[PDB]
Amino acid sequence: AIAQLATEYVFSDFLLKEPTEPKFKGLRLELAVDKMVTCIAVGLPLLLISLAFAQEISIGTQISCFSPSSFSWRQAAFVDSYCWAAVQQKNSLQSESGNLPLWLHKFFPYILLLFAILLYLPPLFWRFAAAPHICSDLKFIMEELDKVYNRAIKAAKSARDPIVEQYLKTKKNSNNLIIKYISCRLLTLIIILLACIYLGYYFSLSSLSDEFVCSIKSGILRADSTVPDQFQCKLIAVGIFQLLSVINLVVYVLLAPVVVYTLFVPFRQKTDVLKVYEILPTFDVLHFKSEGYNDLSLYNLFLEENISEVKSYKCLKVLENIKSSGQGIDPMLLLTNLGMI
């Protein structure tokens, strides 16, 4: 049913499943925009494949060939099957457009699924090659961040009564994690552009290329005179393929700019979460995180992403907002907060 495909591929959490493992519990490891780009770019061709053969659009078989009236039911079935298998053998069939459109019309579902798989590959390589490293580092950085905030509030309360920073400075040096990231993004962009080219070509087909003339006259049927010289076959469901092909092309050409934008990782590093903790006195008062094609920018993005899960950040952010209001003071209201755990 058309509605079941809808549920399964848009309304269900298809490819939105969190890692079924206690190792990554609430850690994202994939920027939300990357997750949605992958979800669209991969699930859309699958949904389109499923729609192209929905029982309420499909009339029946994919090919029909109009045998003579003298032919029995089984002879007509033979003609259909032979011509279907003969879209490959170029000698038997004669079409105005050529054989390549016939190939493309027969194997449209396979090509769309191939594009889905190729678009799924780079996210897989990211999830299996570079995800655990950043998961461990980000989790450790968040724990140390919490410890730093605890030290600051403990010092403030005691007055009333930077290992993580250096690790960040270290990550500022290496660029393994960023070349991996932009390589997956670049491959996604390349595959999306190749898919756009292919779909634009396919939609541009003559729309009469689904009609080809086929001849079952190889072998001993060559001498058979009860068999006409050639049959008029038509590939049903090519119009559906071309309509779905233009839909896919529209979505992919809208999606490509998003991938290109993600390609600029430093530009996206904005709304510095580190600034909030920099407001705290104990932590060094510097952003110390921007302006480079280095793993530090990646870690900044992933910190902005997974930073909402730590309650210490939440408290410090609301304190910074009150500072924007500018009514009280940071240490007094922080001691009033009482949000250590």
Added chain:
Amino acid sequence: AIAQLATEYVFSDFLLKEPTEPKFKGLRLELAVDKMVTCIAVGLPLLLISLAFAQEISIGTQISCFSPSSFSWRQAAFVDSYCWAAVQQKNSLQSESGNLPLWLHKFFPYILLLFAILLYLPPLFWRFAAAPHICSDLKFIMEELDKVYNRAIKAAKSARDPIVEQYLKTKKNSNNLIIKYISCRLLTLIIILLACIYLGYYFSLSSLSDEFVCSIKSGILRADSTVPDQFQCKLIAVGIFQLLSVINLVVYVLLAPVVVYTLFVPFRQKTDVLKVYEILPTFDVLHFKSEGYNDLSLYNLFLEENISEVKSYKCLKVLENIKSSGQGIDPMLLLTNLGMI
């Protein structure tokens, strides 16, 4: 079966699934009226698509073409398939109404599903872009609210024996959350109006536009004299489409006023929950929450929504009701309550 679709799409919690995650446990993040508007506007076209092809309304195929009696079974099948695929190729078919109604009759399920997806998009953007921010803020505000009530009752009991307010004042300034909200609501309204226009057009079709004349005379069949010049084809299940189209149009034109009403976020801010805590002496005695196209109004709505889950509010509300009765006193009965946790 018709009853299975009924269960699945009205009696099951379809699109009423709470977030399967410990991050949002009992926090709504979507106003009930918005949830029901989305549920209707999205599930209704899906239920209608499923009904239009229920096995007890569907007679069989979607098209039938009345080949000559001389035609064999397979030749008639060829005619049906060719004309079905030929509702796209405008040269072959000749209809009194035109080709656009034929296109619309073939692809009615796809268009309804497209409307379902487009109506599902704005709630998705809300759930993924702006939901976590408000979830964290609302949860923190409720925790701080409980702490304020605990301080008030502790002071009262001790006599017997405003960080959250400033955060609210801060939210009164920014308008990111409200422009996001009214943008999703406005897109929902725009898509619903476009869908109403389309369905009103479709239901207005001639009801004889499902009869078209089709001609399988391209290619080598042009010289074929055993093939009549043209066939009388009829698109079955167009009457069902038009009946379901008017049902959908009725529901959507009833739904549009609800969306417009939700568009006025300040007007909906009523029955101030903040007033109850304002009755408490320790908290500032002011509503300090109304009258603006600012994130404060949104937070007021979401507070009214998720406010029942905190037991402290429940106790203070029953105390306010007793005040409406006006028998005892607030602090004495509050100390009698003993509802700290």
Added chain:
Amino acid sequence: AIAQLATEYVFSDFLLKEPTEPKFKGLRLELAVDKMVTCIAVGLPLLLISLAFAQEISIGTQISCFSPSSFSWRQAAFVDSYCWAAVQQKNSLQSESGNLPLWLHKFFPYILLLFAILLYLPPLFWRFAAAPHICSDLKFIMEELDKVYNRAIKAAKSARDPIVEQYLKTKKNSNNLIIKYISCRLLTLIIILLACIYLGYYFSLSSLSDEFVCSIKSGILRADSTVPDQFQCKLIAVGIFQLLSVINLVVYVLLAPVVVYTLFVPFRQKTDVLKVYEILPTFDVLHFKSEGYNDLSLYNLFLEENISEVKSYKCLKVLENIKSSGQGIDPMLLLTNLGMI
């Protein structure tokens, strides 16, 4: 299978599913008679729809038209499909009863499902609009009730060795909850009466209205002389529809008095649970709950319903029964009970 439908729709807890949420755990929020009225009034048309197309009653298609013997298999299929789609187009078909019975015979399942949905709507509005308010209030009232009993037994034991009442007095004033309740009940009664009228009309159809004469002579077939002027079509499964229609009408006309009886909410307030606690000295010795079209009567009904879950009520009730026996004394046996938790 007929037995699977039986299990699913009578023997399973269909629409008897308790709220899958920790917010309402054991709280009913719907009077048992209302639950059964909704279950019947909604599930019966669905079960009837499923039965009308059970594989052991259905002979095959829904319509058959008796084409001439000269017609091929596919021409006969065209005739069936055309006439099926032509029960809408009034110009083609000529029936003795009219076109409205033909419409009604084709769309009987849809009309029954429409009635099921309309009857499901008022319980949905109750469950989503007014259920949480009463859930919170009733739960709080029960907790306070338990606290009052604990205070009474503690005072009695100490001798050996009314916030909830005022909240009840407050609820005696407002009438929002009761107008909502009687509005849902009144809409259920109105829809049930409209459904009874429709089913009584439908069962009164001529029983020969399923035979109509149909003519496939529009378009180019008008000039076709191999096509007879008109065909004798018959809508199979109309007798089944009418039999199931009278079954549904019988059940609904038996159900309407039950809805009317529920409409008198004060009359149903009986066997005062408050009287038991009134027997206790510490609580005020008054029922203080009856005789009004006010939310207090609703709360009385829901208290009588959800009152069995509190063990304190159970103990006090057995003490009251012993008082009916009149052997010992209330405080002594209450202290002997030892049922604080």
Added chain:
Amino acid sequence: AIAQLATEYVFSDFLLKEPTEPKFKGLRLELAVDKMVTCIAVGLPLLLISLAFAQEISIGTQISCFSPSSFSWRQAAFVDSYCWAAVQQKNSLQSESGNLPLWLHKFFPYILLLFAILLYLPPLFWRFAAAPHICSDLKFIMEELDKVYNRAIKAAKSARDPIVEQYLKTKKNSNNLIIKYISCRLLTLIIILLACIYLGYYFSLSSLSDEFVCSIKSGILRADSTVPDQFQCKLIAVGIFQLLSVINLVVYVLLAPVVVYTLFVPFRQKTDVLKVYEILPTFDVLHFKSEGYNDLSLYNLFLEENISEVKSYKCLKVLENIKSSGQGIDPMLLLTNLGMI
């Protein structure tokens, strides 16, 4: 459906299921590259088998034989069935290419599944023969490693206020675990090369080898003159087999170099995790793990793999990175860490 196969065989965790047992919880026991090599090499032929008979590529039966028009429906069915069963009996059928291509065309799915099973066997032998030994040893080594780090930090803190090494030296001697490992890898490589040879042969078939002449003239039909001497049969879905055969060959010839690379187990031992603990004073300052076709190299690889799960390693690694930054000192920041458990 083509999309269901996609989900099941690429997007689901097919053969990525962690051991459903509390014995191995988070221990990998299979290097990630080996896991992906097995997953590809085994799941690809299964996905290809499922695709070759997808309902949207399959026209119908696998063979059709073009009986005379005089033949009834059942006689034609007999011809199809006889020739299908007669691709084995070499006497009846006469083909230009020979009988071996006919055998190969009939049993292509079975051969692909045979390759899948043979490629699944070596990982099974590894999982059942040698996995528990290394699981127990690695887990014990990690526990002892943690104890060594705890002793070092305890000594450092006390100043402020090698059983696992010898087991490693012992493992440096035996070579049972490494000959088992390279034997499974070598069998995987051998089977992959044999499969590549077979698929390259199969794709090189004449593409007209699917047309064979078949004769139902054994037994009493020999004297039957109503039966023609021979029939023209065609094996449909051979073009699909050859296309999928070249896809499989491409993937396997890309996969073989990966297996060969895994075959060099010492070369892969890189980024010594032991070096980090060697930086600690209490542990012996030596890698003492490299350069041999001995079980020590295997244990090094598996240690690098399962080493992220121990938090002690994480702390020591970030300390080593800070040493790379060279700001503070190892013992002071280690005592500051406070990551014993």
